[PDB]
Design a protein around this ligand. Structure first.
Ligand code: CA
Ligand code: CA
Length: 69
């Protein structure tokens, strides 16, 4: 709901600083943000979050990542 909200989270989610997050990288924060998760639950979420299906999530796609499903 805020342009800054997902923006500050990018420094928390993207450790490489390259502008994109992958399953293994997302898992690192997801296991603390949410519980009852397998590695596969993260990957299912990537496949549904990735609007263009290329295996990575950029800034605009990150907003959609959390509003998907
Ligand atoms: Ca990254
Ligand atoms: Ca993508």
């Amino acid at each position: 709901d805020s342009e800054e909200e997902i923006r500050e989270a990018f420094r928390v989610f993207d450790k490489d600083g390259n502008g994109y997050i992958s399953a293994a990288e997302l898992r690192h924060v997801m296991t603390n943000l949410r519980e009852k998760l397998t590695d596969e639950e993260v990957d299912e979420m990537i496949r549904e979050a990735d609007i263009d299906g290329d295996g990575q999530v950029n800034y605009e796609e990150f907003v959609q990542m959390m509003t998907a499903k």
